[PDB]
Amino acid sequence: DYSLCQQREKLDDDMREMFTELHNGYRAAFARNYKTSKMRTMVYDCTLEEKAYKSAEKCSEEPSSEEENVDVFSAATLNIPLEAGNSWWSEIFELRGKVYNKNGKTSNIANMVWDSHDKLGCAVVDCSGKTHVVCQYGPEAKGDGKTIYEEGAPCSRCSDYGAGVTCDDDWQNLLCIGHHHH
Template sequence: MLELLAFICTVLTVITGSTAASCPSNNGMTDEVRQIFVDRHNKYRSLVARGLAKDRFGRFAPKAARMLKVSYDCEVEANMMSWAKRCVFEHSPSSERHQWGQNLYMSSETGGNKAEAAAAAVDSWFHELAESHVPHRNRFTKRILYKLGHYTQVVWQSSNKIGCAVEWCPDMTLVGCEYKPTGNWLRSRIYDEGEPCQTDDDCQCSGCTCSREEALCIAP
């Protein structure tokens, strides 16, 4: 199991069915690792959508009416990977990532298992909720930026394309994901609250289908 010494930097059951893209250039990534990133994100988005995600006080985050299921994007991965290869634990300028969102994670272990590092990173980002509180009125504010900024990006309703990287650096393992379109808009709602979709029409987006089992909407 990956030994963690995790420092987290913030930006402004496994669920299957959404297959990670097989990108033209592996760039040190594998389809197995890509799939872990996709499945882990969708596992947690489904947990929130079904009203099963708890904060440190035992309160549940509100259910999500139209939470989108994430899929993998090779263009986003290439952008994230180019930054990760610099082995600097800080966010890239937003202009260098097309204004996409970005979550970062690092471990002191080097040369470890990339699949385990991928899982540990997403777990860490989502675990912010368990260490803090459900956002007031389900909105993103400056007050929660440094406490919940990774969690909110993981479950931001409209951020349904991800691309990620795991890079072995000389003094750390650096993990990052970028999100298209970006989340964490100040004063904006993290996701639409309500009972999860039961029909495709409930998703209220063109061509979307409802996965009732996951409580997620799948964009075309």
């Protein structure tokens, strides 16, 4: 549901969906291969999208807070969600276990697979001829020295999140989802 999002020049509902699906696929792959016990399903959040735009328009090439990812490019090869997603996912090679080490090498992948993250919103802007892609995540949790994900059977600890949260049959029963119609 993107009803609360406004018209953006370089982002539409299609791309919002592409961003969300890409992240959840990354998180499902990560949960199965690293055995993460409470990896949440992400849902698109139009409030985080507005936060992402307000931050993106500053045209920094670095994140301004722990829950922000930034990517900068021109002459893209892939579409925008894949160009950003792949750059951020590639940091997986610099991870060294479940503990986040703030070293400039893993901030994007850590935001994407932080187990308690369940919301994202993104922004696409031009800065002096380069595309900046920014995604903002929630809730706030990421930090140096903190545990990115707890380890164990997938979905075994969904109930840690409390009311209404169950294993998500939409994502191969690997992720945890909040109460919803389905």
